Amino acid sequence: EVETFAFQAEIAQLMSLIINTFYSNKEIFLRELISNSSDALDKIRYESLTDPSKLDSGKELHINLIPNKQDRTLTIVDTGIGMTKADLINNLGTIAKSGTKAFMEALQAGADISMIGQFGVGFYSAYLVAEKVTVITKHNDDEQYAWESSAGGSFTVRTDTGEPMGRGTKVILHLKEDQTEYLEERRIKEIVKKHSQFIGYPITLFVEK
Numbered sequence: 001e002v003e004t005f006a007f008q009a010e011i012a013q014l015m016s017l018i019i020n021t022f023y024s025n026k027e028i029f030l031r032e033l034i035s036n037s038s039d040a041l042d043k044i045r046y047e048s049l050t051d052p053s054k055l056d057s058g059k060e061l062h063i064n065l066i067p068n069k070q071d072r073t074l075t076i077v078d079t080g081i082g083m084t085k086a087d088l089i090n091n092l093g094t095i096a097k098s099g100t101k102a103f104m105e106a107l108q109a110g111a112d113i114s115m116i117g118q119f120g121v122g123f124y125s126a127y128l129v130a131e132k133v134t135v136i137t138k139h140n141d142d143e144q145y146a147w148e149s150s151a152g153g154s155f156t157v158r159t160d161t162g163e164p165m166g167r168g169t170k171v172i173l174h175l176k177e178d179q180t181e182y183l184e185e186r187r188i189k190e191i192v193k194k195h196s197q198f199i200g201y202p203i204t205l206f207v208e209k
């Protein structure tokens with residue numbers, strides 16, 4: 001049972017701009033997704049300070065980077081607070097309408113795409129390198145759901161029957177054919193060292209057989 005939704009016009013405009021603008025510094029997508037994971041881990045940590053049972057779904061707070069050259073996917077896994085179904089539909093827990101508005105005024109006033117995270121819509125930088133993005137998420141107050149979009153103005157939401165997560169979010173980047181450098185160990189290591197050196201959670205880069 002798959003539900004198909006239309007993006008708000010402003011968000012469709014944001015994704016088309018990310019996809020169509022010539023902009024070589026694509027590597028910032030990873031910084032933005034790791035920063036979102038860190039924000040999500042901060043949220044569940046804060047809730048656990050007054051209610052330890054919030055971590056019954058998983059005590060470990062971490063970020064895993066899982067490249068898969070056979071599937072041509074880069075997966076970013078975190079054990080943060082996760083998102084409800086309502087969060088997923090409402091632009092993955094962002095204020096993307098007003099964030100896009102501010103972002104696009106900044107771009108016409110000197111800014112470049114690498115500053116997207118300052119406007120709260122850094123998730124959509126995934127489409128710098130991915131032709132399709134799948135988001136699997138589990139919030140303590142909801143069931144496990146799968147969000148998916150290949151842009152084109154629509155996204156889908158369905159209950160996820162796959163591997164249970166416990167709690168957190170898994171962003172699966174189905175990479176573009178010419179963006180497979182982000183599956184190489186030394187390239188991922190370089191980007192993490194360059195842009196995410198002060199993230200306060202363990203970031204584990206998985207290796208492949």
Ligand SMILES: c1cnc(-c2cn[nH]c2)cn1
Nearest residue numbers: 036037040082083123169
């Ligand atoms: C990218 C975008 N959003 C997230 C997230 C996780 N929990 N809540 C929001 C993670 N990575």
